[PDB]
Amino acid sequence: GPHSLRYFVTAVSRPGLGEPRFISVGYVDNTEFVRFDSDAENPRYEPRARWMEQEGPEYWERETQKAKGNEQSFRVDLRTLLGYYNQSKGGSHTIQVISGCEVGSDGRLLRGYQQYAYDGCDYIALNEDLKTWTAADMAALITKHKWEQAGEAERLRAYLEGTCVEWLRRYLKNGNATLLRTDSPKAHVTHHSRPEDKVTLRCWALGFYPADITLTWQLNGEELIQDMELVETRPAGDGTFQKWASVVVPLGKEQYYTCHVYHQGLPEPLTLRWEPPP
Amino acid sequence: INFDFNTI
Amino acid sequence: IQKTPQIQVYSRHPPENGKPNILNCYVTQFHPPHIEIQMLKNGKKIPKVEMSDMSFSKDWSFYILAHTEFTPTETDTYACRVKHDSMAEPKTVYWDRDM
């Protein structure tokens, strides 16, 4: 299937608290593999996956220097944006970028990214044509014109279609065996009291990876897509994820309900019911 | 590897 | 616009009284990135609480996982208190061992 190399980059200004904090994080197929943080004792791009450890010293030097250059650009961007939005020099502000490429099974580029946000809102983004820009407001129109006047889309296009794709291929070769990790959910139902003649049945899915999962409750063939409570999928902290979905049912009718768990690691979706303790 | 960003 | 954090407090493994576990406080959907997270046992600040590095999602909002080692008991109360500029006061979410 498809793959992606994306860098998620942030600077946060701290007037009277020092220089802006700059963090740059790389992802292969949505998995963090590199990180740079300006607040580290000695700021360097670091491996965040073991398969990256085989990249030699010159790789780390070059990319550390690139990050330091991007840090400078972001520092400048922040001062510039302060003027564009006529904001006071004393406030804290954030700039964020998502940059990179998505490639299909056949190695062709599906999508190239270059999106900017100022203070958590869209600023400017490269269009799917890889030639033009969408500016979110008046201020971003200044940048749109500047980058048109610099041919920025062409320099960016060469990176996206060339450099990004080539490096993604290399990273995938080194990381395939690790990135392919799949952990199927292990599921169970818990039983909890509700006022009067009702009980809560909670279907748990634990230990799974990737995080993508669906949990459903059925009463006699019908999916209860109205009264089911569910939590956002959440990290266990150990590389695996957790989710639950619960339903309120009549006391004594617990065996009339079934939970189903859908995951990519499951050949057949799981079916389970409340079982009272052994 | 990342892109060398321009300034806004 | 500033985004208000969403908070989940939960254990890494199903809780069993007297057994060493890890308590998590997962905080999502906040902007700006500046955030203060405390974990509380019976209303008192817990000293060793580790924080994941901060990351952001495609909607630009930040997320982070705080965690501490703990051994649940029948009567001990745990909570996560989050202070963020999007909120007028610090938000305290209690651990429910059923959730």
What residue ranges do the domains of chain A occupy? 1-181, 182-274
* Cβ pair C56:A96 closer than 8 A: yes
Could you tell me the CATH number of the domain that includes residue C7? 2.60.40.10
Q: Which of A98, A78, A72 is nearest to A9 (CA)?
A: A98
Residue pair A274/A189 in contact (Cβ under 8 Å)? The answer is yes
- Inter-chain CB proximity B7 and A80 less than 8 Å: yes
User: Taking CA atoms, what residue in B is nearest to A60?
Assistant: B1
C and B interact (at least 3 Cβ pairs within 8 A): no
Total structural domains in chain C? 1
Resolution value (Å, 1 decimal): 1.9
Measured between alpha carbons, how far is residue A94 from residues A11, A108, A116, A245 in Å? 6, 33, 11, 36
Closest in C13, C32, C65 to A235, CB measured: C65
Whether A74 sits inside 8 A of B6 (CB atoms) is no
- The domain of C45 spans 1-99
CB–CB contact B2 A147 (8 Å): no
Are A162 and A155 in contact by the 8 Å Cβ rule? The answer is: no
Locus of tokens 């006071």:
A88
User: Of C6, C55, C61, which has the smallest distance from its Cβ to A25's Cβ?
Assistant: C55
H-helix or E-strand spanning residue C70: strand C62-70
Phi, psi (5° rounding) for residue A172?
Answer: -60, -40
* Structure-solving method: X-ray
Distance (Å, rounded) from C-alpha A11 to C-alpha A118? 10
CATH number for the A1-181 domain, one of 2.60.40.1930, 2.60.40.1660, 3.30.460.20, 3.30.500.10? 3.30.500.10
CATH number of the domain at A182-274, out of 2.40.30.40, 3.40.50.720, 3.40.1550.10, 2.60.40.10?
Answer: 2.60.40.10
